[PDB]
Design an enzyme around this catalytic site. Structure first.
Site, PDB file in Angstrom:
ATOM      1  N   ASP A  91      76.080  56.600  37.375  1.00 24.26           N
ATOM      2  CA  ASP A  91      74.603  56.711  37.173  1.00 24.26           C
ATOM      3  C   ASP A  91      74.391  55.739  35.992  1.00 24.26           C
ATOM      4  OD1 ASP A  91      72.073  57.311  37.843  1.00 24.26           O
ATOM      5  OD2 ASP A  91      72.208  59.265  36.647  1.00 24.26           O
ATOM      6  N   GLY A 101      67.296  66.060  37.013  1.00 23.45           N
ATOM      7  CA  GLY A 101      68.469  66.346  37.924  1.00 23.45           C
ATOM      8  C   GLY A 101      69.800  66.744  37.186  1.00 23.45           C
TER       9      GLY A 101
END
Ligand SMILES: Cc1oc(-c2ccccc2)cc1C(=O)O
Length: 273
Positions: free
Chosen positions: A135, A16
Site C-alpha cells: 500500500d 480502512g
C-alpha cells in the site's frame, strides 16, 4: 495499562486501517500514535516468534522495527476484547505526503527526488526484512518536517514478502498494477515498483496518473505538468505494463534522475521550512 501509560490526544485519521489517535507516552512525554484496529476487520493473522495470534500488521511491524527511521516504529501493542491497539512512534511536527501535496501542489523535482529516494530506501528496508508493504502511496508516507525524513506507515495491507504470486490484494486500487486489475495476480517487487511509479508521478504532477481500471490497463502516461525527461522516463519505466519490464529497486536508484539526492536535513532546510 494502555489507559494509564498513554495520554490520548485527538484523532489523526480513520479509514480502512482503523482509527489513529495522537498520544503521549506518560512516562517520558514521548509523542505516539495510537492505532485501533477492529478484530472483525483483520483478515490476515500471523504469529510472532512466541506463537501468539496477532494481526499480520503487528508481525510485519516487528519485522521492520530497527534504528532505521524510514519505516514507522511499533513501540507497543495491546489486545483488547474486540480490537488491537498499536502504539507507534510519532514524528513531531509531521505531515502525510498526501496532505503535503494537497497544500503545495506538484513537488519540485529536487524535492520529489529526495522524497522518492527515501521511499525507495524504506521499501528496500521492508523487503530486506521480508515485508511487502502493498500500500505504498502518498497517504502512507509521513514527512518528519524538521528532519526532512520520510516514514512509511500503515502495514495493515502488507504481507510477508515471497517470490511466488500473490492472488490477494487489499491495498489501494489506483496504485495497483495492471496484472492485478486484469488477472488478480502480481509478484511483490514488481507490483511495489508499479506503485512507486504511481507515487513518483503523484509527487511530480500533484495527482495520480490513473483513476480507472482501463487507464491502468492501457498504462499510457500523460504528464499534465512539466516534468523532466529523465523523471518521465523513470516513471514510464516503473509503469511498464509487463511486470518483468519494470526496473528493480537498484535500477531505479541508479537511474540518472535519481543521482545527487539531497540529504533529508538539506531537504528540510531548502523545502520544508
Ligand atoms: C494510519 C497511521 O497513521 C499513523 C501515524 C500518523 C501520524 C503520526 C504518526 C503515525 C501511523 C499509521 C499506521 O497505520 O501505521
Amino acid at each position: 495499562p494502555l489507559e494509564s501509560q498513554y495520554q490520548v490526544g485527538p484523532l489523526l485519521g480513520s479509514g480502512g486501517f482503523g482509527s489513529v489517535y495522537s498520544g503521549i507516552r506518560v512516562s517520558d512525554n514521548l509523542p505516539v500514535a495510537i492505532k485501533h484496529v477492529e478484530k472483525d476487520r483483520i483478515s490476515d493473522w500471523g504469529e510472532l516468534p512466541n506463537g501468539t495470534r496477532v494481526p499480520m500488521e503487528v508481525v510485519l511491524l516487528k519485522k521492520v522495527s530497527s534504528g532505521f527511521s524510514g519505516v514507522i516504529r511499533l513501540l507497543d501493542w495491546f489486545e483488547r476484547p474486540d480490537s488491537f491497539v498499536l502504539i507507534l512512534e510519532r514524528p513531531e511536527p509531521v505531515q502525510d505526503l498526501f496532505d503535503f501535496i494537497t497544500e503545495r501542489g506538484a513537488l519540485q523535482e529536487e524535492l520529489a527526488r529526495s522524497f522518492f529516494w527515501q521511499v525507495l530506501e524504506a521499501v528496500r528496508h521492508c523487503h530486506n526484512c521480508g515485508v511487502l508493504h502493498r500500500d505504498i502511496k502518498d497517504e502512507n508516507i509521513l514527512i518528519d518536517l524538521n528532519r526532512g525524513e520520510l516514514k512509511l506507515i500503515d502495514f495493515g495491507s502488507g504481507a510477508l514478502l515471497k517470490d511466488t504470486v500473490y492472488t490477494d490484494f487489499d491495498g489501494t486500487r489506483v496504485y495497483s498494477p495492471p496484472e492485478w486489475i486484469r488477472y488478480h495476480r502480481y509478484h511483490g517487487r514488481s507490483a511495489a515498483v508499479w506503485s512507486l511509479g504511481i507515487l513518483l508521478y503523484d509527487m511530480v504532477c500533484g495527482d495520480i496518473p490513473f483513476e480507472h481500471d482501463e487507464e491502468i490497463i492501457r498504462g499510457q502516461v500523460f504528464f499534465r505538468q512539466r516534468v523532466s525527461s529523465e523523471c518521465q522516463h523513470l516513471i514510464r519505466w516503473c509503469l511498464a505494463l509487463r511486470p518483468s519490464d519494470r526496473p528493480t529497486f537498484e535500477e531505479i536508484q541508479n537511474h540518472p534522475w535519481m543521482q545527487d539526492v539531497l540529504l533529508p536535513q538539506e531537504t528540510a532546510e531548502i523545502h520544508l521550512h
